Symmetry: C3
Subunit: 129 residues, 3 copies
């Protein structure tokens, strides 16, 4: 199987290694985050990762995230590149609150999977298609 | 040649037609739903599916879902796993209404495709990246 | 390497051809767009493409789009099929503004990659799963 190296922000972050069979993986808030209605905050997720060469990760909310927390993800789907593999390259979930809300440290807030990056392409300009 | 088994909620749901291979497939509201501006409702899609093994489905709006139906999708992209294949595992579109709206039975509110699940990965903690 | 043919709206659009290595590609507003709070506009991107056969494109916001512009993409992830390849099939970004905003001509507003279309599938209706 493919290795992903993961570094946690600190010792209190919930470790997320288990036997994986192709399911998306839940990520968790690194700290309590309060968000007022119609405000935006980056929810830190407390993990940095070196993804497999030639891969990227996609991040979206969980199914019940809206019900529980009343937030939407402002970028729709977050794309994490194999190059965001630095020692300070921590992941976040960009949240817009549709109601006053609180997200607690340790809460599952979004989920990711990996995906092979697109193949090499060359764009060629033409005057007409 | 890959098969998806599909169960409809009832006889009144408009069946999905012979497909054009590879194109996303539109899904229809299973009943009339009224949603007031700033309200959230699960819009039933009136279908349950057994996806091929090792696949998942992704569900997103149409480009015109906002113009036609007044809603955004609260989970950004719905991910339907192979394991959501039970006889009562019906699909929904989680709608937040940005204006008052009357969605109708049969309205093509979103679209789906299948995709292979990500490979088996092993997360390994490291102190530093 | 696969080719994508690209046609620009006019001579003033910024050409986006360069060496590609699987990264998503930024697309840019074709003209100034003003969007008031709680309004929606299709932001023109000034490009039409013939994608490789058997492939589709996916379009999402850039990571900083919400901070810089206050817009969310109403369809979450836009899907451009291979058949959207006509001389007047210009791409757009469906934007809903959460605050009064201005996007300037040439601003990077979203990004795309390609992905192979789903395989041929046969839907088989069953009475029970
Ligand atoms: O939802 C997200 C999106 C991105 N990220 C990470 C990956 C991304 O590289 C980083 C932000 O760095 P940049 O501001 O450089 N954005 P990006 O890497 O997309 O830059 P570019 O526009 O050059 O591709 O945040 C998240 O943690 N969550
Ligand atoms: O937009 C969606 C998303 C999910 N679904 C389906 C699939 C999902 O399995 C189901 C909701 O079941 P759960 O509350 O068990 N959520 P999920 O399967 O995502 O759970 P987990 O967090 O364990 O992966 O609704 C939709 O119909 N539309
Ligand atoms: O974000 C997007 C989405 C689609 N598009 C273009 C390409 C796509 O083929 C076309 C239609 O997309 P949708 O299928 O999401 N909308 P709809 O079902 O309303 O259009 P059609 O009736 O043409 O399928 O719009 C964009 O330019 N940006
Ligand atoms: Ca999950
Ligand atoms: Ca409002
Ligand atoms: Ca369509
Ligand atoms: Ca990018």
């Amino acid at each position: 199987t493919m290795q992903i190296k993961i570094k946690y922000l600190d010792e209190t972050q919930t470790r997320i290694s288990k036997i994986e069979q192709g399911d998306w993986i839940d990520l968790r808030a690194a700290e309590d985050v309060t968000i007022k209605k119609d405000e935006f905050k980056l929810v830190p997720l407390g993990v940095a990762m070196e993804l497999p060469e030639g891969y990227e990760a996609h991040v979206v909310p969980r199914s019940s995230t809206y019900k529980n927390f009343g937030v939407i993800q402002t970028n729709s789907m977050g794309v994490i590149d194999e190059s965001y593999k630095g020692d300070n390259d921590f992941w976040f979930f960009p949240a817009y609150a549709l109601r006053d809300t609180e997200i607690k440290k340790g809460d599952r807030i979004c989920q990711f999977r990996i995906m092979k990056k697109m193949p090499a392409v060359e764009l060629v300009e033409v005057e007409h298609l």
